């Protein structure tokens, strides 16, 4: 019994079927593979096409999942898709009316076209099963919990009919108890509010991280006008007829000034985030207070995109409404993709389910075997030095104790947005300056942003207040108080309100990462590490060996630990040996606008990435000429001979484009199949 | 009291405050000037920046209005803006959250910045007045009707609160009787449906022209699921939770195929337009039946953008619900901008109103004086031949009788979308094949689109059935039946259903154009001409003399009559002497895409216009190199020397870009400031 689950839209690698999708539910394209009830492979497409939260059809992810499972396309019994057919096709039809050039191709024909052209897989129509969106969410969240009965809450932006659904789960049967209509969306409310802080889709958890810096009293009475709590667990959101955003009109009327991009977060912005967070908490806890006592369940599974609000999950934990709470590592639409596979399986016979509670999210492609990793590190020799210690974990723990910031790359990549010890950046959690520097110099992000700790399961209750219900802390699902007597000790990982989005790692959840944290604890007295995701501000979490080395070289990390090899940057790295390649979305432009006296303005040159929200950067006339000759095989040194050799200016200009990931730079060849 | 009326968004000529505005009510930007109760000047910005239905701040429209009034900016007593302030600023504020790079500048600051930077005008805050949107529509329509009381109906996409409003007007007072909420918009319903036909905003009139070719029975039961008529003149439009379009989901569910770009209009598409038109007619007649009976009134002014549905207007006229119906030449948001001026004047003092029903839309800038025009046609000498007849109108009437298709440019340009004898293309209305000959050669549009006739006041009733009420026909607001015994005679201007969108011209509405049609009638026995707008498929109606000559030279028009000069194209016109100029939105680009092997793809070259929905076109490497040296003074022939000379290929390629108006091409110099013609 082998079933594939899909989400996302249908565009190929270089083109978009339609420029703007105008919906929130096509993001985080992914593929999941279920065999005999167990989740054997799952990866988000963003890890493979390097476009954060991409909508593109998850073609590379399907291929990787099949390889990981040892399966061929013909072996797959069924494909589930995370939304019902008629809704998707109606949405496509509407987009085709506003893009009249696009051919009338609906989702069934598009899925099968992508699988046929991409994998040589002719999918029969009876094997493609479309699934109600919140049912797929609920299957994913509940079936991985280890629980045999539970209340299941789904909250996101929207499914086909509803923004929220409440289920009873028993054995493998779901029965709906409640739903909430689309204009009542709490995902929509939170995103509407996120736009007021100069952010967009995907930034909601940064807003969540900003909230503890704010006073929730300033805007409590304003947010009170946007929602009403009603009897029997009901609620209402008050719309307006002015704009497609619930929040901005009332806040404009009282003088709120939305943050411009690249500008600081004022106290008013912080206060705004704080009152937003409180508002969503009060509403969710209102829903759960009613449905806990009504349904009689002492256990909760919480899924949908809103279940990535770690603060909300911490409040749910502390509330006492449930004895046990479970959250899945990928609760946004990639998790609905996986749930679609279970629902498609349920429609073709009795449903096989997981035997145990999910403990590791390490489910994507690995980095490669020992021999191919060593050989590929040798190709990078002009840029790195490699040591091979006897006990890499023992050496890493000592480097951490000495104050070094480490890249850490092992095994199969994490499914869902959190790094958990397979694609991570770790450091000593004690000094507050580590938060300041790793924000400013390493991750290059805003100084308000918190950092999350990983602790050994044996020491967790020495440092963190887990009390209340039993929640699962293997995937950093819950924000949790740091014990007051440990907040000074844990200076880098204690947020301004005394909390921490904690990962509790065990020998069972992650044997190697647990050993690293335990050993660091023995050397220092403190078995806690800062754990942030291994990526710079221009990319999703690194996936391949070349991604890891590239990211190590374009971040300011002290040393990289990848599959027991210790990697450091050379004193002077030779960028000339790197082979430039366009990404499928890379574009090069020479542009003239109107100038004075209706002349043609002066030339400018620009590189950009062709997808909705893609960045762009100016390029010099000389680099523009160099980049025009990129053939995908010639090194950068040899390419630069034409423009008169690789100067320091060009190497430096090229390094900055590499760091923003406008093109791909890597030694000749590749690591080969894993 | 001198009062300026404004509509539109706030962008400068070359840049856009934000790329996409996401609303429908910023289009047709325009300026209007009011003095002592009378409309003394009005022009849409599209005529001056040459962008159809443009949203850009109408800085040029204001400048031209001030010059026609003989006023400094500082003489203006008040400025009225066509929407309430909080609504506009809430929309801007929302756009700023979608575009977090845009600085936080709201309408009051933006209006004042544009006037200050554009005209040196320091507008004091107490002179800027914001106006309820449907009141602005109502003032504009009612105050120019000449009636002393009327039922007033405004229907459009939306104002701040409503998609529709009903008023009783009397004297200068408006009293609201009813309103309809935004999601019930009939302008919105019509635009939603128009998208299913491969069209977009602005193309509603094309859908209205297609509707008579279709059978309305086919989709009548489908549209009936989307609306419900109710008691007391109420209706409901049934929404959905899937997409922001009322129409497409139900039609998808029944197998409708939305028309693709460049496809033919199938029979399904034709029936769809027919049933859509009938649906909107039914709903509006439902509204008007109730409010005629309830108000007891015999007179109707109809305004708002839906009032440009002349087929609907013809059905109101025939309904017998009213004795008198008036419709303003600019009933879309450029009319709201005009009405904002009157509302600003009422807001601060008593309100002066026009003394008479508006008979002429000839309110934009003129072409210039005789000396300026002849000196500038001399600048065009290497491309045109110019005669100077004794009686230009007599000559023109003779040429039309011989079968020539004329361009006709005189005096001040028409306010509103219809050409009415000041920027027109006219031809004999009898030959049926003048439709295909003008639709395919001079306008290059779709064959199904009819042409509209102009007829003298004296002859009108001999050819058209005007009955059912006294409507105003000086602006082509009404579609009317052509009398059955005249149809075959009027082959070029009779639609498939035997109707026509007629202009009745009089010695009062337009003396010169009346004289032309009357004289052509004496020559031929049929005092009726075809009258279409003077523009090709890529421009709004021509404005200046250079616009008129440029458009003549890039279509297949036989002769141009412009201010008593008779203009013909030379045998081989020398394109080399024209000076190329970028437009503010012109962009020139070399692109490289990613090759299939992760290489840089081969370089292509493109010219395009930087506004939402702007066209693009590929250019050759040699034309790319040439256009990159455009400096605004050097001629095209001299620029071509750097790439080997102005070969035939290059001249042909440049000409096609000129037809699409990607760049400005005109003789060195300028016609100069428009001369005071003493009016
Ligand atoms: Fe979802
Ligand atoms: Fe309007």
Residue numbers in the entry:
A (entry chain A): 1 to 674
B (entry chain B): 1 to 679
The study reports:
Carbamoyltransferases (CTases) catalyze carbamoylation, an important modification for the bioactivity of many secondary metabolites with pharmaceutical applications. GdmN forms a face-to-face homodimer through unusual C-terminal domains, a previously unknown functional form for CTases.
Intriguingly, a water molecule (W′) interacting with the hydroxy group of Y82 appears near H27 in all experimental data, forming hydrogen-bonding interactions with the backbone amide and carbonyl of H27. Y82 was highly conserved in this subclade, and replacing Y82 with Phe abolished the activity, revealing the importance of Y82 in making water-mediated (W′) hydrogen bonds. Superimposition of the Y82F structure with that of the GdmN/AMP/1 complex revealed that loop 1 protruded into the binding pocket, causing steric clashes with 1, thereby leading to complete elimination of activity.
